[PDB]
Structures are given as C-alpha cells and as structure tokens.
C-alpha cells in the first residue's frame, strides 16, 4: 500500500525493498610488525648533555610506538604540546625532531613543549605545533654532578637563556636537577592493529589499508609473489592475499536482492506471499524485517510453507503437484495463484494439454459443420496531449 | 652510438594479478623500436626515468650513483652490488670521477652471455627499480624478443635525481608517457604488449 | 552501501525509483515478447511414432530423446552463440520454449494449416504438399509425378544446412549482437564507479575519512551526479534497445502466424522464391526460421499470342498461356512447363478476330 | 537557486525523453490500428491470424477512449469425421485427380 | 582543442567514447538502410532498345 500510494490494491506480484545480508563483524589485517622506532635511545640518555644547549636529531622510518609508551610509567613525569600518547599512536611525520639532555628543574619546567619560559621558546625550542612531547625524571639519582645541575646549562624538542644550572643535589626533577627529553614533528608511522581473520561468513575488512564487505573464502588464485590484490575484468576486487599468511582469498559479495509481494486484490484477500529474488532460503532470516517481527510480519520469514525456487525463496505460498494456466508470474515456470478453505499456491505452469495427431499415410479428417465465431480486439491509437511553460515549471 | 630497442622494457605497473585479460594503461615506458644508446663512467641525465641494460659474461658492472651532483653538496643514491649483498645508502657522498673499483645519511638498506635489465623512475618522490634477467646469445645488441621487468625497491627518499653514472657492454633508454594494451596470461603474467601509437594497426 | 552518501542521495528526491518503474518495464516486457512469438498454439500436439511423411525427412529438426529434448538443429543453434546489478530469469524455461517448438513443428507436419484455424484436422503428408505447390500456381499433378526427385531435394537441402551451422557461426551474428550490447553495456555501466567526475577521489571511504564533514559532502555530491548520469545514460539506452527488440519480435511473431500456421503469398516476406512452408527452431535469446521454397530453374524460349482465332471466335486460355514450339500450338500452365492440347474445355470466348492485337489462326479442338 | 535550476531542468528533460519513446511506442500501434482497419474492414484479409483466429470473414470497428476496438467475424470449422484418402484414381489405366 | 580543458574531461570518464560509438552506429545505419530498400536485385537489367 505504501509503495502504490493506494490503499486498494489490484492483484499482481509488486517489488517493495530490497533484501542486503548484513556485515556480522570487522576484520582488520596488517603484516606481521617490526623495526619499532628506537624512543629508549632518546629517553634512556636523558642524563647525557646540557638541556638548555644540546643538539636534537630526526627519529624516521620506524614505527612509532606510542600505545605503550602512553601506557608505559618509563618516566617519572611527560607532557605534550599536541594530543595525548594515546592519540598520538595514530599519527605519522616524516620524523620526529628529538633529543636528551639534563638542567635544573626551574628551567627544565619550561622544556615541555607550548610551554612559557626560556626553553620551549629557546634553549628547549618547541611550539604547541610541536607534535609530540617531553618526559624526565630525578637527576639527582646520577644524572647531577657533586655539586648538583653545574655539569651543565639550563635556560628543537630537548634541544638548542641557556647558562650554567644552579639546581642543587639534594632534590627532583621539578626544580633540582631533572634529567630529560623531548620528541616531537611519511616514515615515523604509528603501528597497526589486526584481528583474526574470519571465513565463510559476510563481515566488514580492510588489508593493509585496503577495505569492502564480503564474504571471505579459501581459494585457488596463484599470484606472483609480489602481487597483493586480484581483479575481474571491470575494474571489481575480487581476491587478497592476507599480509600474515601469504595465501590467498577470495572476495564475495554479501547475498542480496529484490523483495516482492504476491497478493490477489484486495476485494479476495489480505493473506499474501513474499518472494526474496535470487536469495537461498537459508540466507533470509536477516537485514530487513524477518523472523522477530510479530504474527503481523514473521508469518512471512519464518513459517508459512517455506520453499525454494529457480527465482529466489517464497514464503507464504503452498507448493502445489499439479500444473494450471499461470495467473501470477513469479520465473524459471514458476505462477502463483489463490485458490481452494482458500489460501496462496504456487506450481509450475502448465502450457496446454498434449494431443497425438493421429496421423498414417491414408487418413484424413474433414469437418461436418461449422461455427461462426467473433473476436474482440482492442488496440492503442494516442495519448493524452501536453504542453509545459519550462520557464513556470522551473521559475515558478 | 645507437641500437634499436626492439620491443624491450616493459615492467609491472602495479602490484596487481589479473588473468587471461588484455589491460590498457597509461605510464612511464620506453617507447617500441627507439633508438637507444651504447656504450663501453660518462654522466647522463635522468630525464624522466631510465631504461638500463647490460650485457655480461664477467659480473664487472658494480653499481650507479643517482642525484644532482654526487659530490658533497646534498644527498644522493650510491646503489652497489658486491656479490655478498646489494648496499644502498643516500648520503652527502665526496669523491672523484667515481669511486670504481679497480677494473649527512637519512637513508641506508640492504638486500657475454647474460643480459641484465633495469628500470629506474621517480614518482611522488618514490624512487622505483623494476628488474630481469636472462641468458643471450646477441652479445652485441638488445635481443628482439619479450620478457616483462618486475619490481624489486621502492624508496620514499624524495631526493631531485637528474644526473646518473654506472660504477665499473651497456645500453641506455629514457622513459616517456606512453599508453600500452597489455596481455596477462592464466597465471595474471604479462606475456604481450602494443605501443599505441607505433602505428595506425597498433591505435586499431 | 555508505550510509553518509545515501543521506545525500534523498535531496534528490523519485530519480532513484522511476530508474527501476523504467527498468521494470523493460523485464516484462522480455517475456511478453517470447509469449508472443512462441505460444500461438492452444494444445501441445505431439508426432505419430511412425515417420513415414511422404520419403520427406524430419528428423533432423524434429525433438531428439537424447539431447532439453532438442532437435539435432536446435543444439547447434545454442552452441554457436557464446556493484546492486542483478539480472533474472526468463518466465519461460529452454525446456518450455522447446516444447511449444516441438508443438508447432508437429502440428505443421501432420495437419498442415488446420491447427492455425480450428482443432488439428490429419492428411498425409504427400497431400499437404499437393496443396502447397496448388498455393503457388503449380497444379498438383507436378508433385505426385515428381514426388521421389522432390523429396530429395528437401532431404539434401536441409544436410547443407546443418553442415553451414556446423562450419562457421558467423550466420548467428544478430543473435550474438544482443550478447555482446548487454555485456558491453553493463561492463561500461560497472566501469564507470572508478572514475573521479572531479572528486578528489573515486573511492567514497577516501573522501570520508580524508575529510570533514562540510567539506566531504561536496566531494560526495559529484560522485553521487557522476553516478547517477552514468546511471540514467544506461537506462535510457536500454529503453531506445528495448523498443528495437520489440519491433523485432512483432515481426517475429507476424512470421510465424503467416509462414508457418499458413502459406503466405506476400512476395519475399517468407524468404525468395514462391512460398511453401517453414519450420521454426529455438535459439538464444531469439529464433529460427527455415522457409522452403519453391524456385523455377531451366527455361526455354517459346513464341507466344494473346488469342487464338477459329471459327471468327476470338479464344483465350482458361488457365494458361498459349505457346508454341514453332510447328504447334499448345496452352500451358504459366509456372511449369506442360503442354496441353488446345480445346474448347481449356479456353473460353470472347468477340471475333478484329480488336486483338496480335491474335493468330491455329485450330481449337471440340472434345 | 542554481542548484534548483539544474535539479529542475533534469527532472523535466527526463519527463520529456520518456514521453518520446511512449509515443513512438502508441505510433506504432496507431499504425497497425490504420493498417488493420484498411486490410480488415475495408476488405478480407488472407492474412493467417492478421484479423483475428479461424477464417476471416469480416469486421466492425467500435470507437473507445485513446484507441480502437475491432469485432472480427470469423469462420470455425466443427464436428470432423474420418476418411480414408487417396492423392489420385486410376480408371481406363490413366490417373485423375480432383479439381 | 584545449589542452587544459581536455584534462578535465577525462576525469568525467567513458561519456565521451559512448557518444562516438552511438553516432558511429547511427552513421553505419543509414547505409543498411538505403541497401535494403534499393539493392533487392541480383543483376542490373537493361531495357531493350525498342
Ligand atoms: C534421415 O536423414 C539422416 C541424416 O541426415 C539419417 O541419419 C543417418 O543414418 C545413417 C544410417 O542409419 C547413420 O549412419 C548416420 O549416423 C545417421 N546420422 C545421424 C546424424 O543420426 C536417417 O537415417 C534418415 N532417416 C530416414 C527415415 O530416412
Ligand atoms: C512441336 O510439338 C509437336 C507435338 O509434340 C511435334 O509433332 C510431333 O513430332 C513427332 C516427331 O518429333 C511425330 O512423331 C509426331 O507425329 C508429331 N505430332 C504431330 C501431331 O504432328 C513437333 O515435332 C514439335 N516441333 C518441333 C520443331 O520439335
Ligand atoms: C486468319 O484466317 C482468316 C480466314 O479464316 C484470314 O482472313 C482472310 O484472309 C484472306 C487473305 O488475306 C482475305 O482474302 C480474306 O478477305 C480474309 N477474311 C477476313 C474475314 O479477314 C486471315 O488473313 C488469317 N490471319 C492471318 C494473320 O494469317
Ligand atoms: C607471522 O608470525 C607468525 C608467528 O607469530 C608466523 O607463524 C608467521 O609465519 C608470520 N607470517 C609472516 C608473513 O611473517
Ligand atoms: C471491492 O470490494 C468492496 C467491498 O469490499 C466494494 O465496495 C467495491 O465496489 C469492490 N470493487 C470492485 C472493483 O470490485
Ligand atoms: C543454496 O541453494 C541451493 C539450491 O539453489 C540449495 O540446494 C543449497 O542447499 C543452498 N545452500 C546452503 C548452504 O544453504
Ligand atoms: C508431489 O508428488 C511427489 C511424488 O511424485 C511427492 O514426493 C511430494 O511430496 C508431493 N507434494 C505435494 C505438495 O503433494
Ligand atoms: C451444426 O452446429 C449447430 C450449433 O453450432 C447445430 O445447431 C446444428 O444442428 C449442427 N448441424 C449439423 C448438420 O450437425
Ligand atoms: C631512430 O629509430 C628509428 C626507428 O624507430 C630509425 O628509423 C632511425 O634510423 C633511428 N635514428 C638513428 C639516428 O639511428
Ligand atoms: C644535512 O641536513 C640538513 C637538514 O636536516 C641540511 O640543512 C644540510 O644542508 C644537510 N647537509 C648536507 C651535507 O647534506
Ligand atoms: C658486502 O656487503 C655486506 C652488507 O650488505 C657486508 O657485510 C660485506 O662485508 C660486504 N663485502 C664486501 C666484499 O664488500
Ligand atoms: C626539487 O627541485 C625543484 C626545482 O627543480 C624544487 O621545486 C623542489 O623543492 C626540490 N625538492 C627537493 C626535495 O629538493
Ligand atoms: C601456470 O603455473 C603452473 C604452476 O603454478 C604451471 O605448472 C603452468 O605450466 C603455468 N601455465 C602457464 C599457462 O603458464
Ligand atoms: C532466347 O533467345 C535469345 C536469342 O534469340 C537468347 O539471347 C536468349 O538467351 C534465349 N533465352 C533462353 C532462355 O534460351
Ligand atoms: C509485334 O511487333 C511487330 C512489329 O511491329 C508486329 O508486326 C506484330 O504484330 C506484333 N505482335 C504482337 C503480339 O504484338
Ligand atoms: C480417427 O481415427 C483414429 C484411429 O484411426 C482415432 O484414434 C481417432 O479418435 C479418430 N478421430 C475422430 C475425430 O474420429
């Protein structure tokens, strides 16, 4: 009714949605992780040289680990000029300009990045553009000299106000001796994740950056060893390799098609029958309306007589043994008709009745009588004329 | 000196299997039957990538140097072979005529009857190289027959390669765009291809 | 399947549904078309298990029980032709399509025309064709005379046939056009989701996670025209190809109720020469007709003379032509030759001898 | 507005473009309609199933509303028997068929 | 016979290669027509001069 805009209905079979089995659940596949990004080889030195005057370097072409470096206590305070660790582990720069050095705390307060003072601007360069952060700890545990921060200068990331450090032995990082560093922005990439990998069944994925949904399946392609994907002939994805395990396989779509209603008018009946197109019923509990929806729609998705034709599943029709003339088309010889106490049926249409011609070399048959007979013929000759103002039509 | 290239250097667009199919794309190739240069290191531009061959018996050919100028001014390609291993480094390098054999650094990585061959090009600041070899009995021009390059290195160095050399018989081509139909058999390998514009049957 | 996109697809309001009412139209009308041609006939009639047609060989296009049930002719015929897209099946089967195949074959063998016009009325076979050569002006004493020489010739006629179908497929090129226009046309259809139509990419997860928001819905809102051009292109000629393919099924369905439920006279409409019958076979996506003809083929010169004069009577042929070998005279049927002795029982009169031009004196004899 | 404009002027030419294939579609109707009043009503077509099943013998036209009905009278034969059939008799020697 | 411009209409993808292939078969046509309705004869007759 809704897809006429008509609350009679004429008998027919009429196409009201479309059926598009649903992605279950995501999998996610990258290769095999390695060469992490060497960040102890900047932190762990944090004691070396004088923080408001040492050099800094670029960290490049090695992957970022800052997931555990947000979870990880490696120091004993950080701070970051852009987002928190967390986010930062989904980030990527060509490098990261970084460097580690010691300095009294009163100075080294400003040497976390956007930071005030002396440092962020200067000594410890480092704007709140910088995209990463500083970290220290407590100097005076070896990083200090016998006279505390004097074995060097307090005011890039940890790097080149800058005068010999006053801070004495006896205390932290925050005023007295801290030793620290900063790092900070196609190569310094953060790692992937993945999942498991799942088969047989319609799911969301993305390998290595490439993404669809499908259902995902063992196969026989045999690719060069540096290819990655397989293509149909229009242009379509149709095969991956797996970056974990060099197999390959295939890509399927997702089953889907056109839903249909056969109803006879309804001056007959309200009683009618659904027909999921190229659909195996097996598949059809899913994505639209179906077997949770109430007497008022479940009778049509999970009872009903059930049955499987050339044409898709049918629900809500009988299936009949015998053939009659096709009153509803549904495909492949496939009618539906309601019929006698009265209910839908489908069977396959019957062409006519079989007749043996009894013909031999010498018989004839000839008629005795006659009928003459009138037929009616309706034809077409023209449609309604028209004319459209294109400049009220569209100007108003 | 000039040879003709016959229909040599065809290589791999991209990373991708398609099989029993004839695919048309537009690329960087050497063009059928161009002439190409020979010789027996003199420095050459780069254009817009190379095809590089060489004829060997002897394994005398090294390596090739790759950027502006290769002597201390900026970064620049030293690719090697020394039989253990291929050596690649891009430093700020300082050296004469070249440093042959006796017959800063952002970036480092490691990996007649033969006929070597070579692509080398640069796109988005990816520098590629596409390989093969075979045996030959021509040891004295290009073959005329088909074999598609494959790839091996792709680097996203970014450096402004225009000159190049050979560190120590070689053949010298340059890359142009071009539009080529080509042929991937049952096993998604290339196995044929048409230049379009060679001739009115190739445009056909 | 990007619910982002799909958002913006609802500015554009019934464009997406009067696209499927338009290729709903084009689907039953596929089959409609194929009802028209092929179900023309109310019983599926079935041949006698004795073939004894006159020395006439059928069974070459005749149903094969082990083949569907197909003639020998029929397989050949089905040899030799060879992204939210679905296509769907025909109402009628290969194996129903066969059977009304089979039906009018074996109507038009053991009762002529009679099934076109009333229940199938049995004749032999030999009779039936006297009756097509009396349909082409050729009187039925030429057949029964040259009846063996006649079934040969059809015999041997329908082996080159086979033989041309076994040898090249290239007499199936209309059938194979269709094949090739559907799949050329869907391949251009699919081809066409890779192209950019000036967005900064084609591949819709790029420009929404690339983007925000208001900047992704204008890169969205050109793939979403681009598409849904390069959808209305399609179905549009799809409606301009439909309309072709109707033409030809009306013509078709006209060839099989005139050629074979009856012996049409319209010139070349049944192919060249003088209409006799023909036999329809299934193929892909079409059909066949084989239209036997009648052609005349060793001529002789003759003088001729519009009248005859006897008795100052003027005389004309009743059904014939008057010539001579140049001693005699003789009236004869004008599509085979047979001379016939000229009487008052073959001519008729008219006038006396002055106002033809051309007339000429030989005696007419009275029985 | 240029955005309606565009919508607007689209959504017009495709009414437009349908509407000149649906009248190609009744043109050919209106055709056979002119055609089969000139063969079967002004005359008696021999034309098998032109005007109507059976024999032809005549027709009427009847006016209805876009179009045309035809009442075609026709002639079907009833009540066969059996017989047996020969092509040709043999009297004095010589053989005679039916004229 | 812009370059600039030509760059862009490749961007809009097959359109342009549909549209010469239709009137390519439109242009083809015409010849099948005028073929089929005057060449039906397999010899050119020729009147006697008489
Ligand atoms: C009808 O003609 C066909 C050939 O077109 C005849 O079939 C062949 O008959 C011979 C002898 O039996 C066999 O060796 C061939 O193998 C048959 N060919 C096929 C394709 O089956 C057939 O015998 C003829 N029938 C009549 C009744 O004359
Ligand atoms: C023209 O036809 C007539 C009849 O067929 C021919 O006349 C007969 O000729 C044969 C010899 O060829 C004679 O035995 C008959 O007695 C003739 N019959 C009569 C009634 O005369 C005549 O020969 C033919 N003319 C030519 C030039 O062939
Ligand atoms: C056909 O026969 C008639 C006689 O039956 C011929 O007519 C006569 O011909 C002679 C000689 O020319 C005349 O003397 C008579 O006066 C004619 N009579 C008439 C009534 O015309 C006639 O010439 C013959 N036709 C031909 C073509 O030979
Ligand atoms: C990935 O690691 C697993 C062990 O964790 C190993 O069995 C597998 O072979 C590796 N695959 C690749 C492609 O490196
Ligand atoms: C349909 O049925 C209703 C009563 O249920 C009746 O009023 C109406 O006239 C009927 N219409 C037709 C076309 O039969
Ligand atoms: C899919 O459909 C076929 C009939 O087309 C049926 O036999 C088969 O059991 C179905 N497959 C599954 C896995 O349900
Ligand atoms: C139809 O008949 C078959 C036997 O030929 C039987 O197996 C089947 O159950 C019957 N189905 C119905 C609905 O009668
Ligand atoms: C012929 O059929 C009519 C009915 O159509 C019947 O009334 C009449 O008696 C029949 N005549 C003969 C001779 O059978
Ligand atoms: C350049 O190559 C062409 C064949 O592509 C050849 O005809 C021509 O002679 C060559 N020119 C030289 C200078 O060798
Ligand atoms: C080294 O790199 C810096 C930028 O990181 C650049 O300023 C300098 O010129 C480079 N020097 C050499 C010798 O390449
Ligand atoms: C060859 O290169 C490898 C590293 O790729 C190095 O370990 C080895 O010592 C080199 N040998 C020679 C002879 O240069
Ligand atoms: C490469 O050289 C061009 C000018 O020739 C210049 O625009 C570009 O910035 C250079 N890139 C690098 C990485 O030096
Ligand atoms: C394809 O590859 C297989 C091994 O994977 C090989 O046996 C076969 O000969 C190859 N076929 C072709 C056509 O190259
Ligand atoms: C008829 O005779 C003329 C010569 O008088 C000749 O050119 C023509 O070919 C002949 N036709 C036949 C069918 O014999
Ligand atoms: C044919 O033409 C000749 C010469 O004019 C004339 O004598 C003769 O009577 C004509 N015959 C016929 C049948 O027209
Ligand atoms: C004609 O005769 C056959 C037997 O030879 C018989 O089966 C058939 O029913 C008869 N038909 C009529 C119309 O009498």
């Known amino acids: 009714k809704c897809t006429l805009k008509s609350f009679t209905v004429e008998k027919g079979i009429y196409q009201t949605s479309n059926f598009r089995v649903q992605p279950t659940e995501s999998i996610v596949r990258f290769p095999n992780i390695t060469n992490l990004c060497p960040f102890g080889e900047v932190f762990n030195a944090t004691r070396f040289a004088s923080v408001y005057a040492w050099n800094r370097k670029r960290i490049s072409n090695c992957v970022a680990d800052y997931s555990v470096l947000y979870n990880s206590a490696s120091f004993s305070t950080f701070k970051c000029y852009g987002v928190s660790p967390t986010k930062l582990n989904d980030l990527c720069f060509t490098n990261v300009y970084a460097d580690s050095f010691v300095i009294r705390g009163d100075e080294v307060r400003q ?77 310094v990439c953060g790692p992937k994740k993945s999942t498991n990998l799942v088969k047989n069944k319609c799911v969301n994925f993305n390998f290595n950056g490439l993404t669809g949904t499908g259902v995902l399946t063992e196969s026989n392609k045999k690719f060069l060893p540096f290819q990655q994907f397989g293509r149909d002939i229009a242009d379509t994805t149709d095969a991956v390799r797996d970056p974990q395990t060099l197999e390959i396989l295939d890509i399927t779509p997702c089953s889907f098609g056109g839903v249909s209603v056969i109803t006879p008018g309804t001056n007959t009946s309200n009683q009618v029958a659904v027909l999921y197109q190229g659909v195996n019923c097996t598949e059809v509990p899913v994505a639209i309306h179906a077997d949770q929806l109430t007497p008022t729609w479940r009778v049509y998705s999970t009872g009903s007589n059930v049955f499987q034709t050339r044409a898709g599943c049918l629900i809500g029709a009988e299936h009949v043994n015998n053939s009659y003339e096709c009153d509803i088309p549904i495909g492949a010889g496939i009618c539906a008709s309601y019929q006698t106490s009265q209910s839908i049926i489908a069977y396959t249409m019957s062409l006519g009745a079989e007749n043996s011609v009894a013909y031999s070399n010498n018989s004839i048959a000839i008629p005795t009588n006659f009928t003459i007979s009138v037929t009616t013929e309706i034809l077409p000759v023209s449609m309604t004329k028209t004319s459209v103002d294109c400049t009220m039509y569209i100007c108003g | 000196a000039y040879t003709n290239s016959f229909t040599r250097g065809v290589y791999y667009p991209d990373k991708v299997f398609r099989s029993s199919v004839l ?24 254009n817009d990538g190379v095809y590089f061959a060489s004829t060997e018996k002897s394994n005398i050919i090294r390596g090739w140097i790759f950027g502006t100028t290769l002597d201390s001014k900026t970064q620049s390609l030293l690719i090697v072979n020394n039989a253990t291993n291929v050596v690649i480094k891009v430093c700020e390098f300082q050296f004469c005529n070249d440093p042959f054999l006796d017959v800063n650094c952002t970036f480092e990585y490691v990996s007649f009857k033969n ?18 070899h075979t045996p030959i009995n021509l040891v004295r021009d290009l073959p005329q027959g088909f074999s598609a390059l494959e790839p091996l290195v792709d680097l996203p160095i970014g450096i402004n390669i225009t000159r190049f050399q050979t560190l120590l018989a070689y053949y010298v081509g340059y890359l142009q765009p071009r539009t080529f139909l080509l042929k991937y058999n049952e096993n998604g390998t290339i196995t044929d291809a048409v230049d379009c514009a060679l001739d009115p049957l190739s445009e056909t | 399947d990007s619910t982002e996109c799909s958002n913006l697809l609802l500015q554009y309001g019934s464009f997406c549904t009067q696209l499927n ?17 092929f179900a023309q006939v109310k019983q599926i009639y079935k041949t006698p298990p004795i073939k004894d047609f006159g020395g006439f060989n059928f069974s070459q296009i005749l149903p094969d ?24 099946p025909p109402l009628l089967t290969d194996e129903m399509i066969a059977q009304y195949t089979s039906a009018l074959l074996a109507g038009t063998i053991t009762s ?81 989701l890779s192209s950019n139509f000036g967005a900064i990419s084609s591949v819709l997860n790029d420009i929404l996670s690339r983007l925000d928001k208001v900047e ?102 009743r059904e014939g032509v008057f010539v001579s070998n140049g001693t005699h005279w003789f009236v004869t049927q004008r599509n085979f030759y047979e001379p016939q002795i000229i009487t008052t029982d073959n001519t008729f009169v008219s006038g006396n001898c002055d106002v033809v031009i051309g007339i000429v004196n030989n005696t007419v004899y009275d029985p």
């Open chain 1, 111 to 187: 040497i976390a990045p956007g930071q005030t003072g002396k440092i962020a601007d200067y000594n410890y360069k480092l704007p709140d553009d910088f995209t990463g952060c500083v970290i220290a700890w407590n100097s005076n545990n070896l990083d200090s000299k016998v006279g505390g921060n004097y074995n060097y200068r307090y005011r890039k990331p940890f790097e080149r106000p800058l005068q010999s450090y006053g801070f004495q032995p006896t205390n932290g990082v925050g005023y007295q001796p801290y030793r620290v560093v900063v790092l900070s922005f196609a190569t």
């Open chain 2, 23 to 46: 695919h048309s794309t537009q690329d960087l190739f050497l063009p059928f039957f161009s002439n190409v240069t020979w010789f027996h290191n003199p420095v050459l531009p780069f």
């Open chain 2, 115 to 132: 006929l070597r061959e070579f692509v080398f090009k640069n796109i988005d600041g990816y520098f590629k190289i596409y390989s093969k």
């Open chain 3, 21 to 37: 009412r338009a290729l709903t139209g084009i689907a039953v009308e596929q089959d409609k078309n194929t009802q028209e041609v």
């Open chain 3, 65 to 88: 029980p082990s083949k569907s049930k197909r003639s020998f002719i029929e397989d050949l015929l089905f040899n030799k032709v060879t992204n939210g897209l679905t296509v769907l």
């Open chain 3, 112 to 192: 002529g025309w009679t099934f076109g016009a009333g229940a199938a009325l049995q004749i032999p076979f030999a009779m039936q064709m006297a009756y097509r050569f009396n349909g082409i002006g050729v009187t039925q004493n030429v057949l029964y005379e040259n009846q063996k020489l006649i079934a040969n010739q059809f015999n041997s006629a329908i082996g080159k046939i086979q033989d041309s179908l076994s040898s090249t497929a290239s007499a199936l090129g209309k059938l194979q056009n269709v094949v090739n226009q559907n799949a050329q046309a869907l391949n251009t259809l699919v081809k066409q």
């Open chain 3, 216 to 317: 992704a819905e204008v890169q969205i809102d050109r793939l979403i025209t681009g598409r849904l051009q390069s959808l209305q292109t399609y179905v549009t000629q799809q409606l301009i190809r439909a309309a072709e393919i109707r033409a030809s099924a009306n013509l078709a369905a006209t060839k099989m109720s005139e050629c074979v439920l009856g012996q049409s006279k319209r010139v070349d409409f049944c192919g060249k020469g003088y209409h006799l019958m023909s036999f329809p076979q299934s193929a892909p996506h079409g059909v066949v007709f084989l239209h036997v003809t009648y052609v005349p083929a060793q001529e002789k010169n003759f003088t001729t003379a519009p009248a005859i004069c006897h008795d100052g009577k003027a005389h004309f042929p």
